[PDB]
Design a protein around this nucleic acid. Structure first.
Length: 164
DNA sequence: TGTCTTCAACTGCTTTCGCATGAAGTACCTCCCAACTACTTTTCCTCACACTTG
């Protein structure tokens, strides 16, 4: 229950946390050591860097339901473990991600922090339409300047195998 | 003009001494309160049309 800059800071924070919860199920899910974990962490560290700069009263960050998986997606590609469609279907099928419902938090309290303008608009709003999902990845790459930072992006002779 | 006589209406009382065990007048209006559903609210997000090229 707070509006403005600090409302945003915790909106920020909550976004912070669920992604982390997302990542660890990621590790249990695939089991691809420190590596998957730390690359994902700095990726968002890098994402955060940008958010602070256009701060003042910049509230454009309200990253979407898709922003988080785009993050995990790009981090995975850096590593280049899998694929997108496969990942998405697997995730929906097993709810592997905490993606669809945002009640997890650890907030009970973050919830009450008045999901207000933001945190309420977090965790599970709706399912991806048309490019309502590849477009975000591009935006993340732009903010990220991801291609310079990470090697071999979108690759995978494994998607071909998956497909045949 | 004067005195006597009756009847009926009204006054006042008819154990003491303690526990009990207190309750209860109050109508007209109400604003507040509690409610169900619908509607509205704040912040955020993402795409779209057009113009110009050859």
């Amino acid at each position: 229950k707070l509006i403005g800059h600090e409302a945003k800071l915790l909106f920020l924070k909550s976004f912070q946390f669920i992604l982390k919860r997302q990542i660890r199920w990621l590790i249990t899910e695939m089991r691809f050591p420190k590596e998957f974990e730390h690359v994902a962490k700095i990726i968002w560290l890098k994402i955060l860097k940008t958010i602070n700069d256009q701060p003042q009263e910049e509230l454009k960050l309200q990253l979407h339901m898709t922003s988080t998986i785009s993050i995990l997606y790009l981090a995975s590609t850096h590593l280049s473990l899998p694929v997108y469609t496969c990942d998405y279907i697997k995730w929906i099928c097993t709810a592997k991600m905490p993606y669809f419902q945002a009640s997890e938090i650890l907030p009970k309290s973050w919830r009450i922090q008045l999901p207000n303008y933001y945190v309420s608009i977090l965790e599970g709003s709706i399912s991806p339409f048309n490019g309502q999902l590849y477009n975000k990845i591009a935006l993340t790459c732009g903010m990220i300047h991801f291609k310079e930072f990470f090697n071999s992006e979108i690759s995978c002779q494994g998607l071909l195998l998956k497909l045949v």
